Amino acid sequence: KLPPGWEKAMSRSSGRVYYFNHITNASQWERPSGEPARVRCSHLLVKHSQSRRPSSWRQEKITRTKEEALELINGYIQKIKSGEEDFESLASQFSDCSSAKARGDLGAFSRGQMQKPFEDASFALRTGEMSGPVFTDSGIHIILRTE
Ligand SMILES: Cc1occc1C(=O)O
Ligand SMILES: Cc1occc1C(=O)O
């Protein structure tokens, strides 16, 4: 029926169908369009107090809760989707990853190199597509597949 990971859903507030991807946590109103050796992705990471390493270039001690980290992620997704902010700008300013200095770019990678939930979402994203919140042991990610 639909591309890998996509399922139909119903909006509670509007009653209109939408599409949700349970690998990427992406959600959208429009029917989704539709695997390579490698993909290229950028990401914005928000760490939290249960992150594997609760420290980043932004904060020596990361103390925010997972729930607070998800709230930040959700707010970034909202501003990216509205056009108020660009992914690359938010990643450079607010990603708790060293890749912030490269606007979130991680370069290209194969299966087997990244943390599984990140790998799975990356490879289920179509080129140009963005994930919803993706949880790993590092924190919560927004993933943008660029190639
Ligand atoms: C904070 C959090 O972690 C995993 C799920 C949630 C939620 O609030 O939905
Ligand atoms: C304040 C806001 O910005 C974007 C979405 C929302 C919301 O309330 O769901």
Domain of residue 145, CATH code: 3.10.50.40
Whole-angstrom distance, CA of residue 2 vs CA of residue 61:
43
Domain co-membership, 136 together with 101: yes
Domain co-membership, 126 together with 101: yes
Q: What residues are in contact with ligand 1 under a 6 Å CB criterion?
A: 66-67, 70
Domain co-membership, 65 together with 129: yes
Catalytic residues: 43, 97, 115, 138, 141
Q: 99: helix, coil or strand?
A: helix
Experimental method: X-ray
The DSSP element (H or E) to which 27 belongs, if any, is strand 27-28
Structural domain count of the chain: 2
> Which runs of consecutive H residues, i.e. helices, occur in 7-147?
66-82, 87-94, 116-124
The residue to mutate among 48, 66, 68, having the most atoms of ligand 1 within 8 angstroms of its beta carbon, is: 66
Atom of ligand 1 nearest to the CA of 70: 1
Domain co-membership, 132 together with 85: yes
Q: Tell me the residue length of the chain.
A: 147
Q: How many CB atoms lie within 10 A of CB 98?
A: 10
Q: 102: helix, coil or strand?
A: helix
Whole-angstrom distance, CA of residue 75 vs CA of residue 138:
19
10 φ, ψ to 5°?
A: -120, 130
Structure tokens at 120: 């799975």
Domain co-membership, 124 together with 81: yes
CATH code: domain of residue 15 = 2.20.70.10
Domain co-membership, 63 together with 20: no
